[PDB]
Structure 1
């Protein structure tokens, strides 16, 4: 349930929250928000396990 963004185009200003998350594009092979090549999602989960 706890997640953390892993991809973005620009960095953040100090104390900046941004929620808008489409399928990130890792350079070329345009993602068009259609999850093509180089398309990883910024949403990443942790391994919070006992």
Structure 2
């Protein structure tokens, strides 16, 4: 698919994630887009 989606400086609608709280069960829908807290600090917005 190098002929259709390959475009520099654009097409930022496809969004991937890497880390969350728990390992969720297989074939489960991904809806939630709240941030993970670091545990040591009370993360609420931009954190450390």
The TM-score with structure 1 as length reference comes to: 0.51
Secondary structure of 1:2 counterpart: coil
Q: Matched residue pairs, number?
A: 36
Partner Cα distance (2:15, 2:35) in 1: 15
| Higher-Rg member (1/2) | 2
Unaligned residue ranges in structure 1 (runs of 5+): 38-50
Q: Does 1:36 align with 2:47?
A: yes
Name structure 2 gaps, 5 residues minimum. Answer: 1-12
Deviation, structure 1 residue 27: 2.8
**1:20 Cα deviation after fit:** 1.2
Where does structure 1 differ by over 3 angstroms across 4 or more consecutive aligned residues? none
Q: Is the 8 A contact 1:25 1:31 kept in 2?
A: yes
